[PDB]
Amino acid sequence: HHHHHHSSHHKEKLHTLEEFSYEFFRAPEGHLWAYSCEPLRQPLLKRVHADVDLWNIACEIFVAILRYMGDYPSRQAWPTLELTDQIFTLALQHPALQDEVYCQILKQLTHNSNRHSEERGWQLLWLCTGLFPPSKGLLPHAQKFIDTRRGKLLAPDCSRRIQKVLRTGPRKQPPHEVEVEAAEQNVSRICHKIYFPNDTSEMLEVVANTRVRDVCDSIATRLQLASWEGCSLFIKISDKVISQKEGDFFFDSLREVSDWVKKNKPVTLPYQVYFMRKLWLNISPGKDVNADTILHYHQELPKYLRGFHKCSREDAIHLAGLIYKAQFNNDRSQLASVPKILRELVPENLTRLMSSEEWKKSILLAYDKHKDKTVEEAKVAFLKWICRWPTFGSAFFEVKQTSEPSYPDVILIAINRHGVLLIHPKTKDLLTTYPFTKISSWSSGSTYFHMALSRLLCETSLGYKMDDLLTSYVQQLLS
Amino acid sequence: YEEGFDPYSMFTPEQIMGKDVRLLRIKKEGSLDLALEGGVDSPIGKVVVSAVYERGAAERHGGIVKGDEIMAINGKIVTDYTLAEADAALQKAWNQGGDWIDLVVAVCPPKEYDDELTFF
Ligand SMILES: [Mg+2]
């Protein structure tokens, strides 16, 4: 009867695990099914008790629950996240511990006359219901436990979270720092800030079972995008920008990346979450103007300014006019000091081509042609003029190649719709193109990237990024 | 570390051509926490340091970083070892006797490129 909402029209006696404990709890070696400040010496359940070596983890879980609730008879300072990691981590890995965690929490919530302890216990049940459900046998007891305590602040949300986690499956990672902070505030609603390439941000509503794709769906509606195909969330952490897997739970992804960053580059690390375009497949500037002016222009502009493309003096003057218009609109006084602004208008490999006044004069003449355009129209014109370049819509990597004596030691690599592009950093010429149809394999380490088509070997700290983009592009092109 | 170390006394020139070869004497205290990658089986055909974990012994010494190549462990040349073989040799010669570990490393040179581009 999980599918139903039950009502009698009046308050029912508080449901406990007393009757459940007669059949499924081990014998006591204060009730074993009721609150106690005494640490457990053996696990509660007969199933868990019948399995030695699971005894120590079950006891360590109870000690961490006692510590979280403040029932442990000391003040030997504990950060909350370490306690929540101890309570839930091994339960996620060994599902036999999941009913044990629920029974230990419900036990500490039964006949608990200590309001602070009881409040903290409900925060644990709230975190727990967002990770995994109780088993088929325990579910009616946990449901009744919550149903008969509907007036508890977090109780209706615990009931909803069990329905949700049964629908989407369990979490892979224990509570995230953000989830724990909300729990400790007795707040069930969470908003995470999401940053965009156009220097803006939005607050996005997230829950325990929110997947990366759900956040993206909400962002596409919020930004009035025609589609988010090829976009994703990214974590800017340490000196990295890492994409998040669309099918992963948002809080699982945050922890997994933070853990990966800790082992690959050695407290909770600060981070930012960005929403950006990842795959540049079928990008037609003007088709989705909101996507072009929020994402596309602002992602393509810094790659252009770095001087990754092959372009002429005349190309740079023309694009600098559009860039000036996109940034300053009608304000013609921003080119007053050429050294303070030229790096925002012209690719760094081309600034030496003419003097400061010559750039200022040529840019102003170009800019003056956009008097009738809006800022959005300038951004779209910028994109339309560069969208057919073979290096448009690319991720770039500067590497030390060790496989081709005919090429310079340091080369520029572009990964995009056309496959892998090898670029001369001085001339910006395309050395070669490795199309996806010719690539037979690739692999990476933390210090290298290798590709087989006819082999490319290079020194890079960004092999994981190269691998991920190649996989993503290949998976998208196939069907 | 040892100042008087000459790589030409241990390797033939073909084995060290274009490498900055140094000897490091690391004092055995705590866990090494030095991760490796590569191997003779891999695309790079050599054993390199993949990570140096915060805990120490490798990090505490300071002379070993990500990208450096492991050429020898306690006098035994490991340039032709698989990753599993290099890992086993490093774990063995750390536990099995001695107050210290002797690592011959090819120090990775400065990167004349931006190794941290973050654009998509
Ligand atoms: Mg001139």
Side-chain angles (χ1 to χ4, degrees), chain A residues 2-8 10 12 14-18 20-28 30-37 39-40 42-51 53-73 76-135 137-176 178-223 225-245 247-261 264 266-286 288-351 353-371 373-387 389-437 439-452 454 456-474 476-478, chain B residues 4-8 10-16 18-24 26-27 29-53 56-58 61-75 77-98 100-120:
Chain A
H2 151 278
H3 318 291
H4 316 88
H5 174 262
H6 296 235
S7 179
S8 305
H10 61 94
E12 285 286 353
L14 257 53
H15 188 71
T16 70
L17 293 178
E18 185 179 26
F20 175 91
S21 84
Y22 297 147
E23 188 182 1
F24 301 98
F25 271 44
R26 50 90 184 158
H31 308 289
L32 199 70
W33 51 265
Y35 167 83
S36 168
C37 64
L40 296 174
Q42 300 188 350
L44 294 181
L45 267 42
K46 277 196 195 291
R47 295 180 200 108
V48 191
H49 184 258
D51 201 298
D53 309 299
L54 281 181
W55 277 41
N56 189 33
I57 179 73
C59 292
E60 286 184 330
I61 285 162
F62 196 72
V63 163
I65 290 170
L66 284 171
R67 283 161 168 170
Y68 185 97
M69 294 169 71
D71 299 308
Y72 204 82
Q76 208 159 238
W78 291 91
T80 321
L81 202 66
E82 201 203 316
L83 296 170
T84 59
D85 282 346
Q86 185 63 75
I87 299 155
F88 301 110
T89 305
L90 274 310
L92 295 168
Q93 268 63 262
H94 301 266
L97 289 169
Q98 289 174 13
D99 277 351
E100 185 62 30
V101 173
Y102 267 102
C103 294
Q104 285 186 24
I105 294 170
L106 304 190
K107 164 190 163 65
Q108 294 305 88
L109 288 180
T110 303
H111 307 336
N112 187 347
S113 65
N114 309 284
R115 286 208 184 269
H116 178 267
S117 173
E118 194 193 25
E119 185 187 285
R120 297 286 290 179
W122 277 96
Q123 303 172 359
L124 291 176
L125 190 54
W126 184 79
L127 289 168
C128 192
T129 58
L131 301 167
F132 48 77
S135 76
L138 180 56
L139 188 67
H141 290 282
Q143 191 63 44
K144 208 162 190 181
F145 191 93
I146 300 170
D147 292 355
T148 61
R149 289 170 184 84
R150 270 174 194 148
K152 294 286 171 188
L153 183 61
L154 300 177
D157 212 46
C158 295
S159 178
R160 288 187 293 262
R161 291 152 74 78
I162 285 168
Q163 299 294 102
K164 284 180 162 171
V165 75
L166 280 158
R167 282 194 287 264
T168 64
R171 279 264 303 268
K172 310 282 174 293
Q173 301 294 323
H176 189 265
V178 172
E179 291 179 281
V180 175
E181 278 169 16
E184 284 197 290
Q185 284 296 312
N186 307 298
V187 171
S188 60
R189 290 182 75 181
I190 302 167
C191 288
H192 201 294
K193 192 180 272 189
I194 307 295
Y195 289 91
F196 304 100
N198 68 343
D199 301 327
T200 67
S201 64
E202 283 285 338
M203 295 308 293
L204 271 292
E205 282 151 46
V206 290
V207 299
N209 78 320
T210 293
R211 291 193 189 274
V212 171
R213 62 178 183 245
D214 302 326
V215 187
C216 292
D217 276 338
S218 293
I219 291 160
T221 302
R222 176 88 45 100
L223 298 183
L225 303 182
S227 165
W228 64 269
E229 184 183 293
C231 302
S232 196
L233 295 185
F234 292 79
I235 303 157
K236 184 176 191 285
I237 185 170
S238 173
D239 284 285
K240 297 168 189 70
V241 178
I242 306 166
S243 73
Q244 294 181 251
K245 285 180 181 69
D248 273 13
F249 286 115
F250 175 72
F251 290 121
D252 279 349
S253 173
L254 296 173
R255 176 61 178 266
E256 287 183 25
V257 166
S258 173
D259 279 350
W260 183 88
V261 168
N264 287 94
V267 80
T268 56
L269 295 169
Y271 66 94
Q272 275 179 286
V273 177
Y274 276 82
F275 171 87
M276 305 190 288
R277 171 154 304 281
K278 186 184 175 183
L279 309 178
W280 294 83
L281 290 162
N282 305 305
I283 311 306
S284 307
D288 187 346
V289 178
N290 294 332
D292 299 329
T293 67
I294 299 159
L295 314 171
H296 307 147
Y297 176 76
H298 297 280
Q299 283 179 245
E300 283 308 303
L301 174 63
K303 299 184 233 179
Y304 173 71
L305 297 171
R306 284 299 291 262
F308 298 143
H309 314 285
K310 187 181 181 175
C311 81
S312 68
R313 185 187 69 90
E314 302 72 18
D315 292 341
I317 291 162
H318 178 73
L319 293 164
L322 288 166
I323 291 161
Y324 188 98
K325 172 68 184 191
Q327 188 173 0
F328 302 111
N329 193 27
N330 297 311
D331 187 4
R332 209 175 178 274
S333 72
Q334 306 275 9
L335 255 162
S337 180
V338 186
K340 89 171 184 294
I341 199 186
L342 191 67
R343 283 289 301 274
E344 281 186 70
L345 304 180
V346 168
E348 58 189 69
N349 66 302
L350 303 176
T351 58
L353 290 185
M354 32 187 44
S355 79
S356 64
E357 290 299 312
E358 284 296 306
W359 275 120
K360 177 177 186 180
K361 180 186 68 186
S362 304
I363 296 166
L364 285 170
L365 283 170
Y367 160 72
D368 285 342
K369 295 175 195 302
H370 310 312
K371 185 79 197 79
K373 294 185 182 65
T374 64
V375 158
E376 297 58 41
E377 280 168 342
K379 288 179 178 181
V380 170
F382 171 93
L383 293 163
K384 282 186 177 169
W385 220 69
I386 72 163
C387 73
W389 296 0
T391 52
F392 171 80
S394 302
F396 290 95
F397 311 87
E398 276 184 28
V399 306
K400 178 184 175 181
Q401 65 81 20
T402 65
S403 55
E404 186 53 63
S406 168
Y407 294 168
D409 279 1
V410 173
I411 64 161
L412 182 71
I413 291 175
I415 297 174
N416 57 41
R417 67 206 181 275
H418 303 299
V420 183
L421 281 66
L422 274 50
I423 302 155
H424 196 294
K426 183 170 80 183
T427 68
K428 321 300 171 170
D429 282 326
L430 193 40
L431 265 358
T432 200
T433 296
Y434 297 130
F436 291 116
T437 52
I439 306 159
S440 50
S441 70
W442 68 88
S443 68
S444 60
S446 66
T447 68
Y448 70 93
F449 177 83
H450 176 80
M451 185 167 54
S454 308
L456 177 70
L457 180 62
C458 65
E459 289 164 11
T460 182
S461 288
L462 293 163
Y464 78 94
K465 181 174 168 175
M466 298 179 76
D467 206 311
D468 186 71
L469 279 170
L470 291 180
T471 300
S472 294
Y473 270 116
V474 170
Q476 200 53 28
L477 292 151
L478 184 78
Chain B
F5 171 70
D6 184 355
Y8 290 108
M10 192 186 281
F11 298 92
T12 61
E14 60 183 326
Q15 299 174 283
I16 58 168
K19 296 180 201 286
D20 179 5
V21 184
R22 302 175 196 188
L23 179 71
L24 329 173
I26 296 112
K27 195 198 180 78
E29 198 177 70
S31 59
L32 228 189
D33 272 320
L34 183 70
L36 306 180
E37 72 180 30
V40 75
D41 50 326
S42 81
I44 56 165
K46 65 188 183 186
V47 180
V48 306
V49 171
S50 64
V52 178
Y53 308 117
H61 194 272
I64 193 153
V65 302
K66 176 183 181 189
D68 289 345
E69 174 192 357
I70 309 304
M71 298 192 76
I73 308 164
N74 291 355
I77 300 165
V78 299
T79 59
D80 283 324
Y81 281 31
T82 65
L83 182 53
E85 282 163 359
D87 276 339
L90 190 73
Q91 195 193 258
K92 188 184 181 286
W94 176 251
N95 306 151
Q96 199 170 321
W100 38 264
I101 188 191
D102 278 0
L103 296 180
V104 171
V105 303
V107 175
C108 191
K111 293 174 184 76
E112 299 291 300
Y113 57 94
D114 187 335
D115 195 26
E116 50 197 314
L117 293 174
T118 64
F119 315 115
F120 278 95

